[PDB]
């Protein structure tokens, strides 16, 4: 219970929060902060940090003042401000979501503008046009350092990571596509999860490849392009209908 669990957080101290870029290119472009004169390198690298939320989550300088938006850095697991952060440090609970449900159309749970069109890769901060709570997970091969695991095991792992991060609606691992679809109750929660699990390893301490988790490439967590197979579609339609009904009720 994050309020009475703790106050403190201090995820990654301001001594070592991050080095700035990773060398692609020959020369370093001061204006873009991106290496130039060459592009060789798959670029996506695994997060040095992570959100162990039960430990970390806490009261902030924001909580007292009445901040709406949660801390991106906290989600990522590297908020060096900690208790003096102005953005919130906890998993988005229901009440909080309700409170910022007016704004949640235009901008994310992080207080940053949702766009009109999706990014072509479905890669970040979803559109305000299509509301969504549904994350594509990918690069699970790369996130587990090419480990010969059972799909079931992988699914379980995903559940473990994602359940903690937010109230789950439903999850699907797929062998053929080699992916992990997750759906949440609240869009905000989903967003938070995405922020967290971007570039994260799925591995555990008990695994034998724990010390070389950094050398791999992390989870590619993105937005879900809707499932075409028909039952799912039907379900979605039903949900939409229900929503409409609710809206109508509210109106009258």
């Amino acid at each position: 219970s994050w309020r009475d669990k703790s106050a403190k957080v201090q995820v990654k101290e301001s001594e070592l929060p991050s080095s700035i870029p990773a060398q692609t290119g020959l020369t370093f472009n001061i204006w873009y902060n991106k290496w130039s004169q060459g592009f060789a390198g798959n670029t996506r690298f695994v997060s040095p940090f992570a959100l162990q939320p039960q430990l970390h989550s806490g009261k902030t300088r924001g909580d007292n003042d009445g901040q709406l938006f949660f801390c991106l850095f906290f989600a990522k697991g590297m908020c060096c401000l900690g208790p003096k952060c102005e953005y919130l440090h906890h998993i988005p609970d229901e009440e909080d979501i309700g409170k910022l449900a007016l704004r949640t159309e235009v901008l994310d749970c992080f207080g940053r503008e949702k766009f009109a069109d999706y990014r072509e890769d479905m890669g970040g901060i979803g559109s305000f046009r299509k509301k969504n709570k549904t994350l594509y997970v990918g690069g699970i091969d790369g996130a587990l350092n090419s480990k010969h695991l059972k799909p079931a095991q992988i699914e379980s792992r995903i559940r473990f990571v994602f359940s903690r991060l937010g109230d789950i609606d439903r999850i699907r691992y797929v062998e053929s596509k080699n992916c992990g679809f997750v759906k949440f109750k609240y869009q905000a929660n989903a967003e938070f999860a995405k922020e967290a699990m971007s570039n994260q390893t799925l591995l555990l301490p008990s695994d034998k490849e724990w010390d070389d988790r950094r050398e791999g490439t992390g989870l590619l967590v993105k937005w879900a392009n809707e499932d075409p197979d028909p039952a799912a579609q039907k379900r979605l339609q039903e949900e939409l209908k229900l929503e409409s009904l609710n809206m109508m009720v509210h109106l009258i």
């Binding site: 007016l102 235009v106 409409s244 809206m247």
Partner: peptide, 22 residues
């Protein structure tokens, strides 16, 4: 211009439009 919701009914554009369509 801030909420991105119907001026009248305060519903997401999809939803408001959907109702009308229905």
């Amino acid at each position: 211009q801030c909420c991105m919701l119907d001026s009248r009914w305060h519903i997401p554009i999809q939803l408001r439009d959907h109702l009308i369509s229905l």
